[PDB]
Amino acid sequence: MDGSGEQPRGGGPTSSEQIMKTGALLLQGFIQDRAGRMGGEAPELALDPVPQDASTKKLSECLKRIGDELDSNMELQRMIAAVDTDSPREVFFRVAADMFSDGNFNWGRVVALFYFASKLVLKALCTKVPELIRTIMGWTLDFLRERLLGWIQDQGGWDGLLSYFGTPTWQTVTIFVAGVLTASLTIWKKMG
């Protein structure tokens, strides 16, 4: 009966928790893909069910390539290497609130945060500490459930992100992302 009813292409089910669940999957793909650059520990067994979903796959693709391209600039690269890894939560909290004070829903404040987060994850991974890797992920989702979820739901899920992915004049977008990251870092590294 319900299916026999008139439905415009699809339906409108609860995407509130759905979006949250998608975030947990997205973070996995992005981390797993980049973690492969470390090698492994001899996969005698391993669990490979093969990613069935193409949504997260496509999203991780663009994120991976962009994040990888954002490492070409040795200028910003060395700037990250000049960070103070004393207070992991405080550093993350600062940059989280920093790009929130203005309340600018430019979307870039999210993708920029992803690059910063992945850099920290990679750094911790190089220290051989899986524990912290799980902690950073929890913090990333923490802020997401805190306020981000409210903005993602409003835009109809990750539709906004899929529409934010442009191409023309992408160079300016690159400078935009770099500038945002630089700004927060400038307020962080205040002489020490």
Binding site: K21, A24, L25, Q28, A46, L47, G138, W139, L141, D142
Partner: peptide, 20 residues
């Protein structure tokens, strides 16, 4: 938050071990 991050941390692992 603190409690929220814990549940989310679990969710992150929930989906992690779902594909790896």
């Amino acid at each position: 938050e603190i409690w929220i991050a814990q549940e989310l941390r679990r969710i992150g692992d929930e989906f992690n071990a779902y594909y790896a």
